[PDB]
Amino acid sequence: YSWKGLRAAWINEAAFRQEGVAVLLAVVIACWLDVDACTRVLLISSVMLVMIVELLNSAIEAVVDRIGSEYHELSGRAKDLGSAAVLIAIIDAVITWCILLWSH
Amino acid sequence: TGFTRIIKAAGYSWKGLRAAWINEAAFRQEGVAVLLAVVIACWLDVDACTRVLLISSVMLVMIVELLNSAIEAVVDRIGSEYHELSGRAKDLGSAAVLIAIIDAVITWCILLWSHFG
Amino acid sequence: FTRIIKAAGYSWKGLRAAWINEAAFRQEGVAVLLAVVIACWLDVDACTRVLLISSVMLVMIVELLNSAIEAVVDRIGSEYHELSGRAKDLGSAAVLIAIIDAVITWCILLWSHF
Ligand SMILES: CCCCCCCC/C=C\CCCCCCCC(=O)OC[C@H](O)CO
């Protein structure tokens, strides 16, 4: 269950690949710069959160497709809603870094 | 076509935000509360760590609520095919949102009560 | 206040159902209680105390959403006879990242604290 999903998300969508490399990249940047623990955590928790949400949205997209092939207005709403949840996570993480980084 | 997809899903997301605000009423109310909290945190005299924690905590609520709205949208969709509905998934979704708000409340209280006397 | 009690009730019904049905959620429940007690016990600043709790809270949030997704699939697969756990896999991956995030948070904070 755990690892099975992580791989499929990495093989299929760049939206997870781009954030995936970002997560690794963010951790490196956080550890290199001399900041306090709270700042170190907030920078990686933000980027990892986007990955967390992206995985959940990817689960939503998977269910919608399994049910039917009809272009229904409710199922289409679901994939859009989940897509918005990731957007906020991206926005939140971007806002997070900018606020914290502006010191440096 | 990677550059093209950047605006593709941007359209989906923006359409999702519109869809949430119009249909979901709980998203409307929390958004009011959240947007207020964000502005307050943006004008509060606090450190960057405190400022982020104040904004992120209420932002998560919006993120969770959106996922709950997506989940409910699937249950409501499936409700077309099958007559009976436990509502067990929707209850879990509501639970998740609750914990988010609880977290946001606890985060704010702890951060303020320390920052303040 | 007309409908907000109903919403909260739904949230309670879900929490109680998750506590009984899923024993993994039971483990995460104590983890939050632990995090709260540990953070309040140890002499730490507000920002650190929040991050310790918020991490474990985040896991619990994701687990509830994951359990909600699984509850959807378990309704579908029961009647469709179609059994492809693409959703339960991605859903479980999302929880794992929450776990990892909590561990790193607890590591990074406590390592700089001591
Ligand atoms: C350094 C701090 C800021 C960066 C780190 C935090 C943000 C996540 C990383 C990259 C954003 C670009 C990659 C994602 C591109 C869009 C993905 C997308 O739209 O995915 C479809 C849908 O929105 C969901 O399923």
GROMACS .gro file of C-alpha atoms and ligand atoms in nm:
model
  360
    1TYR     CA    1   0.000   0.000   0.000
    2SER     CA    2   0.252   0.259   0.120
    3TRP     CA    3   0.539   0.221  -0.128
    4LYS     CA    4   0.309   0.093  -0.405
    5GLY     CA    5   0.141   0.432  -0.433
    6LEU     CA    6   0.458   0.640  -0.411
    7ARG     CA    7   0.610   0.473  -0.716
    8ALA     CA    8   0.298   0.496  -0.934
    9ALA     CA    9   0.273   0.869  -0.864
   10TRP     CA   10   0.636   0.912  -0.969
   11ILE     CA   11   0.603   0.703  -1.286
   12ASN     CA   12   0.285   0.873  -1.409
   13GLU     CA   13   0.262   1.245  -1.330
   14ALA     CA   14   0.527   1.517  -1.347
   15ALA     CA   15   0.317   1.711  -1.096
   16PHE     CA   16   0.448   1.462  -0.841
   17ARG     CA   17   0.790   1.437  -1.005
   18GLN     CA   18   0.844   1.814  -0.992
   19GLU     CA   19   0.730   1.828  -0.629
   20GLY     CA   20   0.925   1.510  -0.558
   21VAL     CA   21   1.254   1.663  -0.665
   22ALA     CA   22   1.141   1.980  -0.487
   23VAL     CA   23   1.100   1.794  -0.157
   24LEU     CA   24   1.453   1.655  -0.186
   25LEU     CA   25   1.579   1.996  -0.297
   26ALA     CA   26   1.398   2.182  -0.017
   27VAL     CA   27   1.547   1.959   0.253
   28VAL     CA   28   1.897   2.022   0.117
   29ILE     CA   29   1.849   2.400   0.109
   30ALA     CA   30   1.705   2.396   0.461
   31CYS     CA   31   2.001   2.201   0.601
   32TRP     CA   32   2.270   2.408   0.429
   33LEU     CA   33   2.156   2.752   0.546
   34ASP     CA   34   2.227   2.840   0.909
   35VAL     CA   35   1.874   2.878   1.047
   36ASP     CA   36   1.704   2.768   1.369
   37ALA     CA   37   1.517   2.438   1.400
   38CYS     CA   38   1.172   2.595   1.365
   39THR     CA   39   1.276   2.762   1.039
   40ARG     CA   40   1.437   2.439   0.915
   41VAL     CA   41   1.117   2.246   0.985
   42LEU     CA   42   0.874   2.498   0.834
   43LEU     CA   43   1.060   2.497   0.502
   44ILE     CA   44   1.046   2.119   0.460
   45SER     CA   45   0.699   2.074   0.610
   46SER     CA   46   0.561   2.316   0.352
   47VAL     CA   47   0.706   2.135   0.051
   48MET     CA   48   0.628   1.791   0.194
   49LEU     CA   49   0.270   1.904   0.257
   50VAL     CA   50   0.229   1.978  -0.113
   51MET     CA   51   0.344   1.623  -0.180
   52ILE     CA   52   0.098   1.493   0.080
   53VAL     CA   53  -0.192   1.680  -0.078
   54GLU     CA   54  -0.083   1.587  -0.432
   55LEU     CA   55  -0.097   1.220  -0.334
   56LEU     CA   56  -0.447   1.257  -0.189
   57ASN     CA   57  -0.566   1.439  -0.501
   58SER     CA   58  -0.408   1.163  -0.708
   59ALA     CA   59  -0.616   0.917  -0.507
   60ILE     CA   60  -0.928   1.122  -0.579
   61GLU     CA   61  -0.856   1.120  -0.953
   62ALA     CA   62  -0.814   0.743  -0.937
   63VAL     CA   63  -1.153   0.681  -0.776
   64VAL     CA   64  -1.338   0.909  -1.020
   65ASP     CA   65  -1.198   0.711  -1.313
   66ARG     CA   66  -1.284   0.372  -1.161
   67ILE     CA   67  -1.655   0.451  -1.120
   68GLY     CA   68  -1.760   0.547  -1.472
   69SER     CA   69  -1.663   0.697  -1.807
   70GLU     CA   70  -1.952   0.945  -1.821
   71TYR     CA   71  -1.859   1.313  -1.831
   72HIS     CA   72  -2.061   1.384  -1.516
   73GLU     CA   73  -2.071   1.729  -1.356
   74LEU     CA   74  -2.021   1.594  -1.002
   75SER     CA   75  -1.721   1.372  -1.078
   76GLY     CA   76  -1.564   1.654  -1.279
   77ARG     CA   77  -1.615   1.882  -0.980
   78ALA     CA   78  -1.426   1.636  -0.759
   79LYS     CA   79  -1.108   1.638  -0.968
   80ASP     CA   80  -1.122   2.018  -0.982
   81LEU     CA   81  -1.176   2.050  -0.607
   82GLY     CA   82  -0.884   1.818  -0.537
   83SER     CA   83  -0.679   2.016  -0.788
   84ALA     CA   84  -0.758   2.332  -0.592
   85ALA     CA   85  -0.652   2.172  -0.264
   86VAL     CA   86  -0.306   2.117  -0.410
   87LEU     CA   87  -0.300   2.475  -0.540
   88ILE     CA   88  -0.349   2.616  -0.190
   89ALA     CA   89  -0.074   2.386  -0.065
   90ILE     CA   90   0.156   2.520  -0.337
   91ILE     CA   91   0.049   2.876  -0.258
   92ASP     CA   92   0.088   2.819   0.117
   93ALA     CA   93   0.433   2.666   0.071
   94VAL     CA   94   0.542   2.945  -0.164
   95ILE     CA   95   0.414   3.208   0.080
   96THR     CA   96   0.587   3.022   0.364
   97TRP     CA   97   0.933   3.027   0.205
   98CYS     CA   98   0.914   3.390   0.089
   99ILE     CA   99   0.820   3.514   0.436
  100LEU     CA  100   1.089   3.308   0.609
  101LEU     CA  101   1.357   3.363   0.345
  102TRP     CA  102   1.317   3.742   0.321
  103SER     CA  103   1.536   3.769   0.630
  104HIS     CA  104   1.822   3.622   0.427
  105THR     CA  105   0.413   2.007  -2.340
  106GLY     CA  106   0.509   2.065  -1.977
  107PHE     CA  107   0.467   2.442  -1.997
  108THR     CA  108   0.116   2.395  -2.135
  109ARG     CA  109   0.014   2.171  -1.845
  110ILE     CA  110   0.108   2.447  -1.600
  111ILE     CA  111  -0.192   2.652  -1.713
  112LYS     CA  112  -0.406   2.342  -1.773
  113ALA     CA  113  -0.427   2.239  -1.409
  114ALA     CA  114  -0.422   2.605  -1.307
  115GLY     CA  115  -0.756   2.629  -1.485
  116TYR     CA  116  -0.882   2.317  -1.307
  117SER     CA  117  -0.776   2.451  -0.966
  118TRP     CA  118  -0.928   2.796  -1.018
  119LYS     CA  119  -1.245   2.624  -1.138
  120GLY     CA  120  -1.234   2.415  -0.821
  121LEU     CA  121  -1.204   2.721  -0.599
  122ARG     CA  122  -1.502   2.880  -0.775
  123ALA     CA  123  -1.697   2.554  -0.747
  124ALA     CA  124  -1.619   2.522  -0.376
  125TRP     CA  125  -1.712   2.880  -0.285
  126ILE     CA  126  -2.045   2.861  -0.470
  127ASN     CA  127  -2.180   2.521  -0.363
  128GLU     CA  128  -2.004   2.442  -0.034
  129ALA     CA  129  -2.133   2.670   0.242
  130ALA     CA  130  -1.883   2.554   0.505
  131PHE     CA  131  -1.605   2.655   0.267
  132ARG     CA  132  -1.756   3.003   0.248
  133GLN     CA  133  -1.763   3.054   0.626
  134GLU     CA  134  -1.419   2.911   0.700
  135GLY     CA  135  -1.273   3.114   0.414
  136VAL     CA  136  -1.407   3.425   0.585
  137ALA     CA  137  -1.250   3.316   0.914
  138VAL     CA  138  -0.927   3.204   0.747
  139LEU     CA  139  -0.882   3.511   0.527
  140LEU     CA  140  -0.935   3.727   0.835
  141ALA     CA  141  -0.678   3.531   1.035
  142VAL     CA  142  -0.426   3.555   0.751
  143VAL     CA  143  -0.449   3.935   0.730
  144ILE     CA  144  -0.422   3.962   1.109
  145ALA     CA  145  -0.113   3.740   1.111
  146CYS     CA  146   0.031   3.954   0.831
  147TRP     CA  147   0.002   4.273   1.038
  148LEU     CA  148   0.090   4.123   1.376
  149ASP     CA  149   0.427   4.212   1.528
  150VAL     CA  150   0.571   3.859   1.541
  151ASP     CA  151   0.871   3.664   1.415
  152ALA     CA  152   0.872   3.491   1.076
  153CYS     CA  153   0.837   3.150   1.240
  154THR     CA  154   0.535   3.266   1.439
  155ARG     CA  155   0.390   3.448   1.137
  156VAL     CA  156   0.413   3.140   0.915
  157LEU     CA  157   0.268   2.909   1.180
  158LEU     CA  158  -0.030   3.143   1.222
  159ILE     CA  159  -0.101   3.153   0.848
  160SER     CA  160  -0.024   2.789   0.764
  161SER     CA  161  -0.246   2.652   1.042
  162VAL     CA  162  -0.554   2.826   0.903
  163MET     CA  163  -0.447   2.757   0.544
  164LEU     CA  164  -0.446   2.383   0.616
  165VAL     CA  165  -0.813   2.409   0.712
  166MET     CA  166  -0.888   2.540   0.364
  167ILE     CA  167  -0.683   2.258   0.212
  168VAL     CA  168  -0.859   1.987   0.413
  169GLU     CA  169  -1.205   2.133   0.349
  170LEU     CA  170  -1.132   2.126  -0.025
  171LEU     CA  171  -1.038   1.758  -0.006
  172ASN     CA  172  -1.353   1.694   0.197
  173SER     CA  173  -1.551   1.873  -0.073
  174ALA     CA  174  -1.385   1.654  -0.336
  175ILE     CA  175  -1.461   1.341  -0.135
  176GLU     CA  176  -1.826   1.439  -0.087
  177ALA     CA  177  -1.843   1.512  -0.460
  178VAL     CA  178  -1.746   1.150  -0.524
  179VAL     CA  179  -2.000   1.017  -0.273
  180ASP     CA  180  -2.271   1.237  -0.425
  181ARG     CA  181  -2.164   1.114  -0.769
  182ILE     CA  182  -2.171   0.747  -0.669
  183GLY     CA  183  -2.507   0.817  -0.504
  184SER     CA  184  -2.651   0.830  -0.856
  185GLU     CA  185  -2.571   0.466  -0.929
  186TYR     CA  186  -2.636   0.309  -0.588
  187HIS     CA  187  -2.946   0.387  -0.383
  188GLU     CA  188  -2.819   0.324  -0.030
  189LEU     CA  189  -2.552   0.542   0.135
  190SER     CA  190  -2.383   0.483   0.471
  191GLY     CA  191  -2.240   0.834   0.487
  192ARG     CA  192  -1.944   0.682   0.671
  193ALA     CA  193  -1.691   0.836   0.432
  194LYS     CA  194  -1.851   1.180   0.463
  195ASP     CA  195  -1.833   1.153   0.842
  196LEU     CA  196  -1.460   1.080   0.826
  197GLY     CA  197  -1.416   1.380   0.598
  198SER     CA  198  -1.599   1.601   0.847
  199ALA     CA  199  -1.378   1.460   1.122
  200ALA     CA  200  -1.062   1.553   0.932
  201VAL     CA  201  -1.179   1.912   0.888
  202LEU     CA  202  -1.263   1.932   1.258
  203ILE     CA  203  -0.913   1.826   1.362
  204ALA     CA  204  -0.770   2.084   1.121
  205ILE     CA  205  -0.972   2.362   1.284
  206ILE     CA  206  -0.883   2.227   1.629
  207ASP     CA  207  -0.518   2.238   1.524
  208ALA     CA  208  -0.560   2.593   1.393
  209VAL     CA  209  -0.727   2.699   1.717
  210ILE     CA  210  -0.465   2.531   1.937
  211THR     CA  211  -0.181   2.670   1.724
  212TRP     CA  212  -0.315   3.025   1.753
  213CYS     CA  213  -0.390   3.004   2.126
  214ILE     CA  214  -0.045   2.867   2.210
  215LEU     CA  215   0.137   3.117   1.987
  216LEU     CA  216  -0.059   3.417   2.115
  217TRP     CA  217  -0.064   3.326   2.486
  218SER     CA  218   0.315   3.297   2.469
  219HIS     CA  219   0.378   3.602   2.251
  220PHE     CA  220   0.135   3.795   2.471
  221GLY     CA  221   0.162   3.816   2.850
  222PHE     CA  222  -2.555   2.798   1.512
  223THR     CA  223  -2.859   2.648   1.338
  224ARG     CA  224  -2.669   2.379   1.148
  225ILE     CA  225  -2.319   2.387   1.298
  226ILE     CA  226  -2.409   2.135   1.570
  227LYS     CA  227  -2.515   1.889   1.301
  228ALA     CA  228  -2.180   1.930   1.125
  229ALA     CA  229  -1.986   1.878   1.448
  230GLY     CA  230  -2.199   1.574   1.523
  231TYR     CA  231  -2.102   1.426   1.187
  232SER     CA  232  -1.739   1.494   1.274
  233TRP     CA  233  -1.786   1.313   1.605
  234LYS     CA  234  -1.954   1.015   1.440
  235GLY     CA  235  -1.656   0.990   1.207
  236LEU     CA  236  -1.394   1.015   1.481
  237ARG     CA  237  -1.569   0.755   1.695
  238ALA     CA  238  -1.608   0.524   1.396
  239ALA     CA  239  -1.241   0.564   1.305
  240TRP     CA  240  -1.135   0.490   1.663
  241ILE     CA  241  -1.327   0.162   1.665
  242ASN     CA  242  -1.283   0.040   1.307
  243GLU     CA  243  -0.918   0.130   1.254
  244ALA     CA  244  -0.668   0.028   1.522
  245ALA     CA  245  -0.400   0.233   1.346
  246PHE     CA  246  -0.596   0.549   1.424
  247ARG     CA  247  -0.594   0.434   1.787
  248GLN     CA  248  -0.214   0.443   1.779
  249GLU     CA  249  -0.215   0.791   1.626
  250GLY     CA  250  -0.459   0.904   1.894
  251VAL     CA  251  -0.215   0.832   2.176
  252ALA     CA  252   0.060   0.990   1.964
  253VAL     CA  253  -0.120   1.324   1.979
  254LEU     CA  254  -0.170   1.288   2.355
  255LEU     CA  255   0.199   1.203   2.379
  256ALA     CA  256   0.303   1.500   2.166
  257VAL     CA  257   0.096   1.738   2.379
  258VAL     CA  258   0.231   1.606   2.710
  259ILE     CA  259   0.591   1.589   2.585
  260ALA     CA  260   0.582   1.941   2.439
  261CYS     CA  261   0.427   2.094   2.751
  262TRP     CA  262   0.668   1.902   2.975
  263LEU     CA  263   0.991   1.993   2.799
  264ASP     CA  264   1.093   2.356   2.824
  265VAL     CA  265   1.055   2.473   2.467
  266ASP     CA  266   0.943   2.787   2.286
  267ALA     CA  267   0.599   2.833   2.131
  268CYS     CA  268   0.708   2.774   1.771
  269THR     CA  269   0.869   2.444   1.868
  270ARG     CA  270   0.570   2.337   2.078
  271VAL     CA  271   0.335   2.399   1.785
  272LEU     CA  272   0.544   2.210   1.529
  273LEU     CA  273   0.565   1.907   1.759
  274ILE     CA  274   0.187   1.895   1.789
  275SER     CA  275   0.093   2.011   1.437
  276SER     CA  276   0.300   1.730   1.287
  277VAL     CA  277   0.110   1.458   1.473
  278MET     CA  278  -0.217   1.644   1.412
  279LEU     CA  279  -0.139   1.642   1.040
  280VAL     CA  280  -0.093   1.265   1.041
  281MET     CA  281  -0.431   1.222   1.210
  282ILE     CA  282  -0.589   1.454   0.953
  283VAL     CA  283  -0.442   1.262   0.660
  284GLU     CA  284  -0.536   0.925   0.811
  285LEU     CA  285  -0.899   1.036   0.841
  286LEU     CA  286  -0.901   1.152   0.480
  287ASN     CA  287  -0.729   0.831   0.372
  288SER     CA  288  -0.986   0.630   0.566
  289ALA     CA  289  -1.260   0.830   0.394
  290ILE     CA  290  -1.114   0.749   0.052
  291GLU     CA  291  -1.082   0.382   0.148
  292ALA     CA  292  -1.444   0.385   0.266
  293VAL     CA  293  -1.545   0.503  -0.081
  294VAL     CA  294  -1.350   0.230  -0.260
  295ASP     CA  295  -1.490  -0.032  -0.022
  296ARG     CA  296  -1.840   0.063  -0.138
  297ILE     CA  297  -1.745   0.053  -0.505
  298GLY     CA  298  -1.541  -0.267  -0.513
  299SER     CA  299  -1.800  -0.453  -0.306
  300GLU     CA  300  -2.057  -0.442  -0.585
  301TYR     CA  301  -1.857  -0.375  -0.902
  302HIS     CA  302  -1.631  -0.676  -0.836
  303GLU     CA  303  -1.351  -0.457  -0.972
  304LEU     CA  304  -1.051  -0.471  -0.740
  305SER     CA  305  -0.770  -0.231  -0.827
  306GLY     CA  306  -0.634  -0.050  -0.522
  307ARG     CA  307  -0.478   0.244  -0.705
  308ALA     CA  308  -0.655   0.474  -0.459
  309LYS     CA  309  -0.569   0.287  -0.139
  310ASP     CA  310  -0.204   0.284  -0.246
  311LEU     CA  311  -0.183   0.657  -0.318
  312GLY     CA  312  -0.386   0.722  -0.004
  313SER     CA  313  -0.145   0.521   0.210
  314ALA     CA  314   0.151   0.696   0.051
  315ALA     CA  315   0.008   1.030   0.158
  316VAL     CA  316  -0.004   0.913   0.520
  317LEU     CA  317   0.354   0.786   0.505
  318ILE     CA  318   0.481   1.130   0.405
  319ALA     CA  319   0.292   1.273   0.702
  320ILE     CA  320   0.465   1.020   0.927
  321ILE     CA  321   0.806   1.102   0.780
  322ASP     CA  322   0.740   1.475   0.816
  323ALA     CA  323   0.653   1.426   1.183
  324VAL     CA  324   0.969   1.225   1.250
  325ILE     CA  325   1.195   1.482   1.084
  326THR     CA  326   1.015   1.763   1.265
  327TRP     CA  327   1.063   1.588   1.598
  328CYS     CA  328   1.423   1.510   1.506
  329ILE     CA  329   1.522   1.855   1.379
  330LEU     CA  330   1.356   2.038   1.669
  331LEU     CA  331   1.479   1.816   1.952
  332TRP     CA  332   1.831   1.789   1.808
  333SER     CA  333   1.866   2.167   1.813
  334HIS     CA  334   1.696   2.184   2.153
  335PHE     CA  335   1.944   1.947   2.316
  336LIG     C1  336   1.072   2.658  -0.258
  336LIG     C2  337   0.930   2.689  -0.214
  336LIG     C3  338   0.830   2.686  -0.328
  336LIG     C4  339   0.825   2.554  -0.403
  336LIG     C5  340   0.785   2.436  -0.316
  336LIG     C6  341   0.636   2.428  -0.287
  336LIG     C7  342   0.547   2.408  -0.409
  336LIG     C8  343   0.559   2.273  -0.480
  336LIG     C9  344   0.673   2.263  -0.576
  336LIG    C10  345   0.674   2.306  -0.700
  336LIG    C11  346   0.561   2.374  -0.773
  336LIG    C12  347   0.563   2.337  -0.921
  336LIG    C13  348   0.537   2.190  -0.946
  336LIG    C14  349   0.390   2.157  -0.962
  336LIG    C15  350   0.332   2.208  -1.092
  336LIG    C16  351   0.180   2.207  -1.097
  336LIG    C17  352   0.119   2.074  -1.057
  336LIG    C18  353  -0.028   2.069  -1.085
  336LIG     O1  354  -0.093   2.161  -1.126
  336LIG     O2  355  -0.079   1.948  -1.059
  336LIG    C19  356  -0.216   1.924  -1.098
  336LIG    C20  357  -0.304   1.962  -0.981
  336LIG     O3  358  -0.284   2.100  -0.947
  336LIG    C21  359  -0.281   1.875  -0.860
  336LIG     O4  360  -0.304   1.739  -0.890
   0.00000   0.00000   0.00000
